[PDB]
Amino acid sequence: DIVMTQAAFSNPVTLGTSASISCRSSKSLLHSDGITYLYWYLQKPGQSPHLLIYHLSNLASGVPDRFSSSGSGTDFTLRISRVEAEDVGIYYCAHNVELPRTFGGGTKLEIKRADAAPTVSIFPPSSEQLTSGGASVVCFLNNFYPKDINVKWKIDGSERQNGVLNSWTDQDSKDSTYSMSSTLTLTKDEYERHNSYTCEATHKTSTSPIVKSFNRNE
């Protein structure tokens, strides 16, 4: 069956500049009719795939004219001129020359923008959660760029590794930034026996960590 090969990440691209996404087929998709049976789909964050290009170079209905594709029967390049923040997503190549129908692994289009420090926010356990018997401290580190970020938790000044749950968003379709959530969970009994909880975020936009904390006594 046909192996459709693409890289997981595009070369990053500044807004207004041009992007390319490569794909290769293991079997040639160019037939005697002069048509190449190659298709491109975009899967925007949260959504299903949608068709961009059919038969190698044809633009699908309602797709911006800035998208295009070209290639041989085996090597293809999707190109996006003047890239907009809304173009962010995962782009898939596919064929329809045999069953099984197969797709590439998807290439994430990586938008490059101005650096931005995270907005950090910390939150103590709610009375609701405390009634259940648990106690979670939450730290949002929001709307930062670039995507790499490190978060450390202290309880009373000592680092706490265990009980930490981290999550990351994809690149935002509107402002091209990233966000992270970090939750430290404890039991109510341990929680009520420490005084200070701190979330510290190291990001390239500051040599110094951004730190938020709260103290149960104030």
Binding site: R101, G106, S126, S136, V138, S167
Partner: protein, 198 residues
């Protein structure tokens, strides 16, 4: 306008059975099912013009009512590896919304929803200890979509947890109400958690 609407899905234990379906609006059409998981990507499984991927022969039966424009996929004796989001896909132009299918020995567990309260203020909701995915989160029934971040759920010790943040001007909270609306259909849970100042 062609539209592919799909439904069914849910959670079963290994060995369990599920029939999913979709309806096209807007005879002349082939229909396929494509499933998506982080570990295997987009995988074509079945098509009716019937053809089936090698991995699901004998487990899946694809079928159509050309009258109703209502195609079905009967998924019997399911395996843990069958877990994923299943798309109706009319090759090559139209995709459905995607219905989640989870096959797992873990049973349905509803979420506990907790409010997170402290120029611009950030608030949030913690949706903790549920199974299976997905849950949906809304703030003020959609009124606040800008400045919302809902994070991917993470599985820890056989339960999912997710969180959502919302950032608004300080002049709008707590003077005005802010509420996260959480649904978890698998467990018929719907909650509307007010964020009250501490």
């Amino acid at each position: 306008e062609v539209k592919v609407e799909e439904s069914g899905g849910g959670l079963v234990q290994p060995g369990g059975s599920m029939k999913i379906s979709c309806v096209v609006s807007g005879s002349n059409y082939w229909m396929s099912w494509v499933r998506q998981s982080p570990e295997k990507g987009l995988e074509w499984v079945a098509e009716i013009r019937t053809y089936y991927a090698e991995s699901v022969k004998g487990k899946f039966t694809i079928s159509r009512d050309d009258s109703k424009s209502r195609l079905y996929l009967q998924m019997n004796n399911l395996r843990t590896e069958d877990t994923g989001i299943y798309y109706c896909f009319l090759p090559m132009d139209y995709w459905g919304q995607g219905t989640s299918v989870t096959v797992s020995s873990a049973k349905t567990t509803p979420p506990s929803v907790y409010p997170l309260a402290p120029s611009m203020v950030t608030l949030g909701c913690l949706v903790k200890g549920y199974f299976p995915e997905p849950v949906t989160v809304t703030w003020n029934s959609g009124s606040l979509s800008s400045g919302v971040h809902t994070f991917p759920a993470v599985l820890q010790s056989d339960l999912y947890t997710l969180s959502s943040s919302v950032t608004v001007p300080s002049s709008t909270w707590p003077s005005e109400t802010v509420t996260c609306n959480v649904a978890h259909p698998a467990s018929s849970t719907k909650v509307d958690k007010k964020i009250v100042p501490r």
